[PDB]
Design a protein around this ligand. Structure first.
Ligand SMILES: Cc1cc2nc3c(=O)[nH]c(=O)nc-3n(C[C@H](O)[C@H](O)[C@H](O)COP(=O)(O)O)c2cc1C
Ligand SMILES: Cc1nnc2c3ccccc3c(N3CCc4ccccc4C3)nn12
Ligand SMILES: O=C(O)c1cc(=O)[nH]c(=O)[nH]1
Length: 367
């Protein structure tokens, strides 16, 4: 209630990234609210060995620098994708680079990987991983890392392999961000051939950490899984071309999806630069989940992202083929209550539809 009144005022009177930097500060000093519950095993999901306590996690770009991991996870989430991280720190693009429409529940952003750099973020994860040893309440909470490239870097691979060698020992999973619209020429890395080299080189570098170098100082105590974040602005030819790469390279998951450049039906996001996230992306990401779940013949697990605000929105994703649901615009528009309400909303529906558990619902639309 206290943070909900304050968030409403924030959305209508204070700048989007000031708000964002303000709440993250109230997180680093552990004064954000808490969601206490062991979470019903009813909603338990998994991607290989990654055991999620609940199907809801916080998507990348929220805790870019991993300075707020404990307080964000303590809001009722099972996992956090920290990043996107780049080898060297970046100030990103010119501000204001975050805008929101309340009536249509959407966000437009041209951040351009604003982060402290892989080395500083690694130290921030080391400190959370050290806390995770003493604090038992965060021992089953997964932390993923989204790895990217610096603006001026011509060879994406060198940057991705750099990131692995520093933060790889502390990640439960590594997300390859090849879908940023604010990093010039990055979506060109989603092309079948390039992505095949990317995934393989990234997987070789994770494998090499184990070959060359207690070691896995993460939740799993195992080597990080590899996920790729895909852009919704692709043709059917590319989406199927990618599927063959993901099936052959054996990617451990695929995050569907990132922000869109296609949504131009928002009047307040007209001449603002960046990708649109929120309630407008909802249907676009679900159909991309659907397409990819059948282009990859149900083999590659899916991490849903794009317009998830409710239990019905969450079930829509799970049934399309999603194993986990990633949040972002829900935390922005609905506030701190997001994961409490959405777990509750979903559990009501899982019972109402008659599923014994969540794992029974994954891809049941295609049944
Ligand atoms: C301000 C902002 C920054 C973002 N930065 C990143 C990022 O660094 N890496 C990433 O993979 N996604 C990033 N995203 C995309 C989110 O992870 C998410 O996929 C997107 O917001 C769509 O989900 P939503 O509709 O639930 O918000 C960003 C989104 C916003 C609004
Ligand atoms: C209000 C508001 N107007 N714009 C934004 C915004 C923009 C980008 C990312 C997050 C947020 C955000 N959240 C609100 C929820 C939350 C929870 C934990 C840690 C930080 C935050 C910040 N609140 N917010
Ligand atoms: O850092 C950004 O600007 C960014 C990255 C990403 O993957 N998606 C997004 O919309 N913004």
């Amino acid at each position: 209630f206290l943070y909900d009144i304050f968030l409403k005022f924030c959305l209508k009177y204070i700048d989007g990234e000031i708000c964002h930097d303000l709440f993250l500060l109230l997180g680093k000093y552990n004064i954000l609210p808490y969601d206490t519950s062991n979470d019903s095993i009813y909603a338990c999901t998994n991607i290989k060995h990654l055991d999620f306590i609940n199907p809801f996690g916080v998507a990348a770009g929220f805790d870019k620098n991993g300075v707020c991991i404990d307080s964000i996870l303590k809001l009722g989430f099972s996992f956090i994708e920290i990043g996107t991280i780049t080898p060297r720190g970046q100030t990103g693009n010119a501000k204001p680079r975050i805008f929101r429409d309340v009536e249509s529940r959407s966000i437009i952003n041209s951040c351009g990987f604003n982060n402290m750099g892989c080395d500083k973020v690694t130290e921030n994860l080391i400190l959370f991983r050290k806390r995770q040893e003493e604090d038992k309440l965060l021992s089953k909470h997964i932390v993923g890392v989204s790895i990217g490239k610096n603006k001026d870097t011509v060879n994406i691979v060198d940057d991705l392999k750099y990131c692995i060698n520093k933060i790889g020992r502390y990640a439960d999973y590594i997300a390859i961000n090849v879908s940023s619209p604010n990093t010039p020429g990055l979506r060109d890395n989603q092309e079948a051939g390039k992505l095949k080299n990317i995934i393989l080189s990234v997987k070789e570098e994770i494998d090499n950490l184990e070959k060359n170098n207690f070691l896995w100082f993460n939740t799993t105590k195992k080597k990080p899984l590899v996920f790729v974040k895909l852009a919704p602005d692709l043709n059917q030819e590319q989406k199927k071309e990618i599927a063959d790469v993901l099936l052959e390279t054996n990617i451990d998951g695929m995050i569907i999806s990132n922000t869109t450049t296609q949504i131009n039906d928002i009047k307040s996001f007209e001449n603002k630069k960046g990708g649109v996230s929120g309630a407008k992306l909802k249907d676009i990401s679900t159909k991309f989940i659907c397409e990819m779940y059948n282009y990859t013949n149900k083999q590659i697990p899916i991490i849903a992202s794009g317009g998830i605000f409710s239990g019905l929105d969450a079930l829509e994703k799970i049934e399309a083929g999603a194993s986990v649901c990633q949040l972002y615009s829900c935390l922005v528009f609905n506030g701190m209550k997001s994961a409490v309400q959405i777990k509750r909303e979903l559990n009501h529906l899982l019972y109402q539809r008659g599923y014994y558990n969540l794992k029974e619902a994954i891809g049941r639309k295609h049944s």
